[PDB]
Symmetry: C2
Subunit: 105 residues, 2 copies
């Protein structure tokens, strides 16, 4: 899933009037730009958006694509605790998590 | 308040307690296959926890454990800030577009 992203971004733009058409719908919007932290809310709002948007159009194109991206990230997430290693290499990982967190705000 | 340079102190204590912490060699802890830390916060602090529960307690290492505990809470609060504010669809779509936008960097 490499630039099925640029296709997903083009489909989004091109279906903005349709999706934007419900003005009653309120969805979760993170207060910040740590997107990775908020994947649950992003994809569950996307979900509500779907069960209320009229189906079958060329939006299906958008919807399967995001579905793919969702899958990708369900896999990324399994990759978090699937491998157990030794305490050195876990410390290493925490060290460098901690090292990038100095900038994450 | 946002933990700022409690990060460097945590970094310094980590290093300084690496002999003790790495002293159990039978211990196997979850380590993420990739560097997308924030998608993995759960697994990070579950491993830290297992590690705690068999590191001997009371030492200078408590410093290190309250420090991460502090960071944990700050992230528990970032995570509550995901769904706390509900806005309208275009500002949701804005945030989606720009999430997808930094996702092409891989």
């Amino acid at each position: 899933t490499s630039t099925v992203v640029k296709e997903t971004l083009t489909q989004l733009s091109a279906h903005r009037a349709l999706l934007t058409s419900n003005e009653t719908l309120r969805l979760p919007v993170p207060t910040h730009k740590n997107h990775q932290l908020c994947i649950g809310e992003i994809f569950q709002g996307l979900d509500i958006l779907k069960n209320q948007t009229v189906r079958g159009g060329t939006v299906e194109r958008l919807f399967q694509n995001l579905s793919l991206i969702k899958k990708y990230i369900d896999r990324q997430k399994e990759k978090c605790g699937e491998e157990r290693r030794r305490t050195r290499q876990f410390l290493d990982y925490l060290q460098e998590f901690l090292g990038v967190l100095s900038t994450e705000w």
